[PDB]
């Protein structure tokens, strides 16, 4: 989507002091976060409900069986995690207009309390691997269906990748909290 | 679409003197409504159509109740949205040029009227989630037919997410109108 | 389409001495209607055509009825309209290089004209709603037939709100042509 | 396509001294032709071949009857003139660094030339209108068969105006072309 | 793709001193190439394996046929060639930094030899039409078969316009090459 | 995607100290990785799976056997690569504002690791060439199967090419590492 | 079916004593209307409905328009009308058990009476001629649709072959009434 | 099917003495029951299910609806009918060879048992007309649907004929249950 | 069809006094026409409107276009003209009851007038072959199509073999009307 | 198929002495049974595996399903019930010739025995009712599938018809053999 | 067909007086030629032009390859055969009426001709196998195409069966040719 206007907003955004560990922290989120999903990501799961077949005769099959599957696709929950962590780095524009280290500290810890709940929901809502095939026993299907995924591999991939990387953040968000006392 | 224009718009009306309520209130509109709409919820609504089918073989009832089930897409009403909330605060261009805190007041009373006037429309046209069956009985469909829903659980958690979000700058507007008096 | 050019040349163009009833005129066509339909309108008309269906047998009937019955788009007529409108505004540009308050009212004149004859013909063109169904009896269709819309409901709104919108702007033309005397 | 990279070759190429015809000649030029392409006509012409059927079984006449029908389309046909006629303007450029009214004669006589070769040959390879309907006997088709068009009223207007623009523009050239005599 | 890139690195690279030859070379290249193929050769090339068809009902004998009769597109072809081409001019931003007329003869050297080459692959991939039906004798199609190609005669023209320019080009090297001596 | 993000933090990032051998590496990297990557490898994967057919009636077995012969696109390895070998000159921004040769160092030890490393994960992931047929025995298909691929040629003669560009970065780099000693 | 029954039944009712007239009316009634119907009619009306269509969509349209321009196949017609003529002579074989001229008249009243209503019948059923087309306004049809018929000329050659025959035999019957007094 | 042994049967049990009433009570059941069925009745019902259609998407529920509205042919009915009517006369054939008017007035009795038991039933089973539409809410079908039925107007008739030949056998069947008091 | 009641009426009908040329005719009729039309024909003609097919999209043309074509099939027409020359021979069993040489002559007569007519007639319908192509310009089929025929080779082996045994035939009627004077 | 073998068969077989519970016997088999199957069942399982579905796009699952819902069909076992229960009464006609009321006994012994199992094997076999459902796990279908019947209610039917009549003969045959003592 | 009145046609002409060889040619004749062709050859041939396939997508050139493939089909010309050799012997029924060696010496002569020239027509019309592909460059097809056979396997072993019997007949034709001298 429209990537230009975040990164005009995180411009104004990193003129506040940081320590080395939050400017390591920042050079992670923009590298391995912003630019991967926003280049990479977004045409892997493009095809995802067209590529996705059931082996049936029942009309409103495949929609119910995609839609109890892949409950929320994952780039999404990529893109909506990137926006919620760079918050409250995005809250010192509208604190420095009010002026015009309390409040680091505030931001430290809610950034951590982001960072770790949306890691434990990735590892809740997906897992570690995309399967090929899936079991589906869900309305209009009668009894249990075999249903077949589009590119399980490349999106394994991007699951361990992005896991790897939200680990590293928060490896880097316990070691500033450390850091502060 | 073209969000950048808006942007500009905006960047241009927020030269304006506000309170700490309304520099929250900007804060929340500008990350929770429009990065979010802008950027996650465009394709989120691009096979609603073309993944909607009804178990039947009459010709054009699938438009029938594609049409009488999603009357307005979701994404177009808060776009709307979005442009309506942001009216009062790009009126002070065209106060400014006229003048080279009452009007402050009157911006606020819209503002509130608007949140208000919005978040019940919300509720009345959608509810509280998108389920994924639908019974049709609009001609040409024969009686009552059943249909299938693309996507239902991540057109569910948007409506929530929004709701929530509007309820929010609602609270935030009543506020500021019992903190003017 | 490429609407920051137009948007660099109303830039260019709003730089003209103006009244009140001017400014507010310039503030409902740029929000009312250049945000809405840079938008939002695009995405509505875009399967027309892909979603309009005959009960038929006969190759060629989908083109002829859909061509009977939508002979230029909504949105199309709306981009002209929007362009045709801003033109004597974008003749300031124009007049201010041969330089280096009759224009003003000239200008005033043709756009009071521009803006009535649009509405006209935005009520012959089209009228208040879009039917779901239609009546076809074109070659190559034998005798008539019927045809099914996609998105009536959807882009009924859109007529009456453009319809309302556009009486908006023809009541404050009127007004400064009064204004002028 | 990419219209910003010709907008900034203009806004360098119109520095030259120019006469009152001149200037209007490039009103006409940058409002009626430029953002009517470039916004407007791209999408008219996108499902032109997808939306074109023949009455036959045989494989490969769809194929052969629209190109023979559409030889070239229109929409790049107007891109390729706006592009030639823009040249003489965009030779300043190249002339100007030279020296760091004899090439102002010259560019007249040669944009004369290009304005009436391009509205002569729209006049030969397209007419006035675009009818619904063709008859095709070229191989593999057997003897003659017909074919229907998608949207031919909404390309006979496009044609009607644009020959109207073209018009107007080389009526400008002329009268520009008697004033220098 | 991305053109706004190589114009802003095409600006940096147009400070180096040159010849009236060396200037009339960069126009020709920056307005019958960069803009032609960035603007309209896109859209020509979009359906071509779409809209190839072959005559039999033998599985993947189409995907034979495509990459037998166009192994590289025209568009990437050109696409390259302007990359290439402006490869000499591109070394002076990596130049002139070093320093902080033997490279302007190098870089002619370099230019021309280029410029012959991409020529004369031009002649011997493609040749100076495009025909409407294919022979093809590809496993796993069964001996001859006959295929049939889309938009033919647009992409004639295409093809004898580039080699058109391509061959004004090498002409205006040579007359710089033999300007230097 | 969005490539003029990665444009505007790399020319943040070319203002550090660099040799002779450090600036054609990265003229290299400029011109024959991104700008043919962000131009002209994006469409030719565009139907990679849409016109891969597989010889059977089994459904799921493309989807299988797409995935078993392509389980990491071609084009989005060399994205990943290009943004990660970028990485070392991307952290010179970090570093500048920690201030405010050890670091040069440290950077070419590891620019090196990176292009050999992938140099030969590209070697062993694809090869030299791509087929035209592929032989599948995964599940769900029966015993053997053939399948056949898009555009086979033309992804060769990409993969050659970018084996070649990264062997020339390795040699720079390596010629670069002998340098320091 | 089974006309070797009605011939073992024929072959005893033909022992009555007869006049020469009602001879003759017997061979007229073996050969013209037994033989023809009972070797040549059946396969003609064999392919009636499966190759009867009309040009719609709507599922059961073919059913309404066939029953309603065919309520009763002529080949059955026919045969019910041999079935029942012979009625009068088969009676003979329970009347002559019965005595182990005033039957004879008794019989030719009712041969005539019904030779001459199946003759009227024939021509308010059928007509003269079976068209190529029918138009069908029956539902679920929607208004009138075309239908077109299968082996239309002949049928016509057998509704003018029979309606002939049948008359010849009314002229028989009314010559041996005439011939009692 | 095999109408030629059932003829050799009744033709030794019609050796038995009879009264006037019984044969013409077995002329009725020779001509009008037996010799229309087994010529006539054998092709009207041959395409019943394949001629049988219903507006769903439903694997299955054409089996099923046309079950429920046709649980016994027509044609066999009135075979097994035929069949149990004359059971009664060929019982003569086993009590003859036993000696070699208490049994006729058996067989009178349980004759008329046979005749009315069956007409009741054949008005219960079918009713007086076949509807050319039925309305059907039988698992797997979803709700209500509608199915068409195949020759209607040419089953009304037979349903006719056969209720008006029963009756008539019924009376004589009652007319000589009085005879014999 | 019932070939075994006209057997049998045959065999009825040649106790009647023949000369030598009567008898070679009658075993000429009895060999070469009802044995090869009763045993071999009949499946010739079974596919014949199921195996004919046109080159459209129109429906209804091939109905059209094989009753254009095929107006009566041959198979009737022999079985037809075989029933209608051995009516004279027919007669004879009338007209033995009746008395119970003039009639020999009247005999010979008409035979001769029908052998002559229908091999007149089988040279006006159809002529000497059955060609594999047919032009068919009739309603409802666009200008003139193009359909292909079903066993032709097959078809001309059987007309031009008809034809020599039909002139055989009226070869020794001729003989026999010569030789009574 | 050739009934009237057996019919003659019979014809022969049936000069044998018999008592009076043996000749009731036989015409409870001539009836109830030969003549129903040889009439009626024959076109009852026509359509058998042509109107039976799975809901699968597996193919193959078709036949596995139809073949282990109906091992035999109920049609093949009854006739060769019927051929099996007759072959004692067949074997008089052997055992005559050789002696050109001990074989009766043996007769009567053997005839017993095979009512009897036929008997418990229809039991076994089918059961008492046709269900319109069956549930399918058999290779290749994957898991469970369901699959629907043709014409259940009247297979039903003729199930509990023909059980009854085997029924009735197994009592007669126990009341002779108790009768023989 | 109807063989029957073959059969009874040949039991009236085999009782002229015949040699030991000429009885045991009709032996030959009626066992290996007559029950085989009417008993197991017409179900062989039925699917012939339903199971034929090529291997292309033109209208109309499985018809053509299947006619120039199979010119006459197999059985017909072997009824033809059998009908065509039996008729020196048929022509003893009407040789028998005109007395009521020298005919025995011709019809020897002319069934040893009729024998030798069937059976080298066989040998030159089929050949002795029936291969499994088909190779057709016959109008409409497109070049040469490969077609595919029904049952060649089963009509090999007819083929080679049937030459032998015919030579076998025709070594028994000229032993008793050589007996008479």
């Known amino acids: 989507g429209e990537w230009t206007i975040l990164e005009r907003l995180l411009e104004a955004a990193v003129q506040q002091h940081s320590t080395m560990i939050g400017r390591i922290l920042l050079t992670v989120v923009v590298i391995f ?21 059931c082996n049936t005769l ?12 892949f409950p ?40 951590n309390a982001l960072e770790i709940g949306f890691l434990v929901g990735q590892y809740f809502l997906y ?12 309305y209009p299907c009668i009894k249990e269906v075999e249903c077949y995924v589009s590119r399980p591999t490349e999106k394994t991939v991007f699951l361990v990748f992005m896991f790897a990387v939200s680990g590293i953040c928060v490896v880097l968000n316990l070691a500033e909290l450390n850091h502060l006392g």
């Open 127 to 138: 897992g570690f691997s995309v399967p090929g095939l899936y079991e589906c026993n869900r």
């Open 58 to 69: 029942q009309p409103g099959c495949n929609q119910a069986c995609y839609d109890r599957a």
């Open 72 to 111: 929320i696709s994952h780039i999404r929950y990529w893109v909506f995690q990137i926006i919620m962590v760079c918050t409250p780095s995005l809250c010192f524009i509208t604190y420095s207009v009010h002026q015009s280290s309390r409040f680091y500290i505030i931001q430290v810890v809610f950034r």
């Open 33 to 53: 976060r912003i630019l991967i999903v926003a280049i990479v990501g977004e045409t892997v799961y493009d095809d995802e409900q067209t590529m996705f077949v």
